[PDB]
Amino acid sequence: HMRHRTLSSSPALWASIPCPRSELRLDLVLASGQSFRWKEQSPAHWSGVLADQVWTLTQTEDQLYCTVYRGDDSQVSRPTLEELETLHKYFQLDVSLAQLYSHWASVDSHFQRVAQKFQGVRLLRQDPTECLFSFICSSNNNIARITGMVERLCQAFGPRLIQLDDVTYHGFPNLHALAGPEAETHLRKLGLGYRARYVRASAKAILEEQGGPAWLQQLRVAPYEEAHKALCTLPGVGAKVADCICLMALDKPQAVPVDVHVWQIAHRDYGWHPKTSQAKGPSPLANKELGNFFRNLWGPYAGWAQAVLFSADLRQ
Numbered sequence: 341h342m343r344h345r346t347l348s349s350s351p352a353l354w355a356s357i358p359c360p361r362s363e364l365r366l367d368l369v370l371a372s373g374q375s376f377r378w379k380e381q382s383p384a385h386w387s388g389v390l391a392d393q394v395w396t397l398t399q400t401e402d403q404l405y406c407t408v409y410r411g412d413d414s415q416v417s418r419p420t421l422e423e424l425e426t427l428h429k430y431f432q433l434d435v436s437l438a439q440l441y442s443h444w445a446s447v448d449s450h451f452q453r454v455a456q457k458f459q460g461v462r463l464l465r466q467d468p469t470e471c472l473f474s475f476i477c478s479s480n481n482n483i484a485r486i487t488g489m490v491e492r493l494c495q496a497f498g499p500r501l502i503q504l505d506d507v508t509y510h511g512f513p514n515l516h517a518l519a520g521p522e523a524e525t526h527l528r529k530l531g532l533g534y535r536a537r538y539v540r541a542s543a544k545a546i547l548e549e550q551g552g553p554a555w556l557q558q559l560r561v562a563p564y565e566e567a568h569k570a571l572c573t574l575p576g577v578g579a580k581v582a583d584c585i586c587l588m589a590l591d592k593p594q595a596v597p598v599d600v601h602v603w604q605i606a607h608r609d610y611g612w613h614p615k616t617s618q619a620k621g622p623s624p625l626a627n628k629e630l631g632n633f634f635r636n637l638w639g640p641y642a643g644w645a646q647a648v649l650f651s652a653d654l655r656q
């Protein structure tokens with residue numbers, strides 16, 4: 341019934357934020373394996389759900405145009421002031437990425453090369469619950485398959501928001517919905533495989549063993565290492581997933597998620613080998629060392645630097 345907006349179709353319903361193309365490139369951020377809930381439904385127009393609302397986003401060289409759909413039978417309108425703050429906090433636009441790029445570039449000749457082509461790759465500030473279960477789905481997986489699992493999971497367990505064209509939009513489920521006695525069998529049917537068990541188990545564990553979503557907010561204000569250790573107690577959450585969550589939803593910019601992907605980049609592009617550890621391949625000790633290598637090199641925003649390289653390694 342209702343349709344996806346463009347800036348040509350319905351220009352009245354949009355609103356802008358002053359945002360240069362060097363501070364943010366939507367096409368390099370919204371599909372770089374941070375969030376799996378954004379799609380280019382028409383050229384230059386990314387649509388996705390954030391906090392029980394759908395948005396479409398597009399941009400010029402110096403402005404970020406955005407528009408909101410409220411879903412329930414309401415009078416359609418432009419984004420409000422508070423809704424623009426949500427979007428401003430989502431992209432973390434307070435932090436100057438240009439100054440960070442040059443700071444990382446000053447000690448990293450490799451980054452300097454990559455930073456020519458790949459500007460405006462920033463870290464999203466995601467909801468902790470959405471980020472946790474999305475990255476439980478990420479193990480031994482690719483962006484396409486992960487995007488499917490999360491889409492189907494939200495349709496099955498999450499509250500419906502709105503339909504635009506054929507695409508039906510659902511908010512991320514609360515933890516109680518994922519923790520129920522049928523959730524594993526349903527999630528296995530939806531294609532998650534072994535990951536189905538960890539999704540149910542972690543939902544159940546955060547509720548009973550940690551006391552619901554308030555715990556994740558406690559980890560936002562806890563120090564990096566306390567949070568990482570706490571998350572590692574959850575079913576299907578190891579060092580790499582714990583770090584993905586720390587970096588992307590618990591405001592820990594120094595967190596460097598380490599698995600085979602940065603291993604390849606570290607070795608091929610930095611000549612890195614584990615010195616202190618004996619074994620030449622990946623291991624818990626070696627992965628930890630590689631995280632410290634990048635923090636030591638880039639500084640306390642080391643995770644954001646990693647995203648730039650990842651975003652470059654995904655584009656050919």
Ligand SMILES: Nc1cccc2c1[nH]c(=O)n2C1CCN(C(=O)Nc2ccc(I)cc2)CC1
Nearest residue numbers: 373374478481482483597601643646647650653
């Ligand atoms: N070649 C390559 C290189 C890096 C990621 C890749 C690939 N290929 C691929 O399918 N992915 C996925 C892998 C799992 N994943 C991910 O790790 N996202 C994530 C983690 C940390 C940060 I900083 C930023 C993104 C979701 C994206």
Ligand code: NI
Nearest residue numbers: 607611612613
């Ligand atoms: Ni070598």
